[PDB]
C-alpha cells in the first residue's frame, strides 16, 4: 500500500547517551587501514 499520514522517524526517541559512540565502536571493524605520515606526531 501507500502510507502518507504517519511519521516514520520514531526510532530517535529511543537513543541513549552512548549510541553514537558504541555505533562508532561497532563500525570500526569495517574501515580501511589509515595512511601513515612516517612519524607518530608532528612534535616527534
Amino acid at each position: 500500500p501507500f502510507d502518507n499520514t504517519t511519521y516514520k522517524n520514531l526510532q530517535h526517541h529511543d537513543y541513549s547517551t552512548y549510541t553514537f559512540l558504541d555505533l562508532n565502536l561497532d563500525l570500526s571493524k569495517f574501515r580501511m587501514p589509515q595512511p601513515s605520515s612516517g612519524r607518530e606526531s608532528p612534535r616527534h
Binding site: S37, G38, R39, P42, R43, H44
Partner: protein, 63 residues
C-alpha cells in the same frame, strides 16, 4: 646627586651617509678609530603552508 662629568665629547655623536666618508672624516681629525661592519639581516624563507604540513615537523600545535 647629579651625574657630574669632565669629558667634553661625551654628547658628540655624528651621522654619516656612507662608510668611506666617515672613515675620511675620522682620518681628517686625527682620531684613532675602529669600524664595525653593517650587520644586514639574512633573507629568511617564510611560508604559510608549512604550518599545516602533512608529515613535516613544522606543524603548528595551536592557532
Amino acid at each position: 646627586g647629579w651625574a657630574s662629568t669632565a669629558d667634553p665629547l661625551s654628547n658628540l655623536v655624528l651621522t654619516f651617509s656612507t662608510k668611506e666618508d666617515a672613515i675620511a672624516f675620522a682620518e681628517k681629525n686625527g682620531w684613532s678609530y675602529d669600524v664595525e661592519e653593517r650587520k644586514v639581516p639574512k633573507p629568511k624563507s617564510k611560508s604559510y603552508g608549512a604550518n599545516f604540513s602533512w608529515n613535516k615537523r613544522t606543524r603548528v600545535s595551536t592557532k
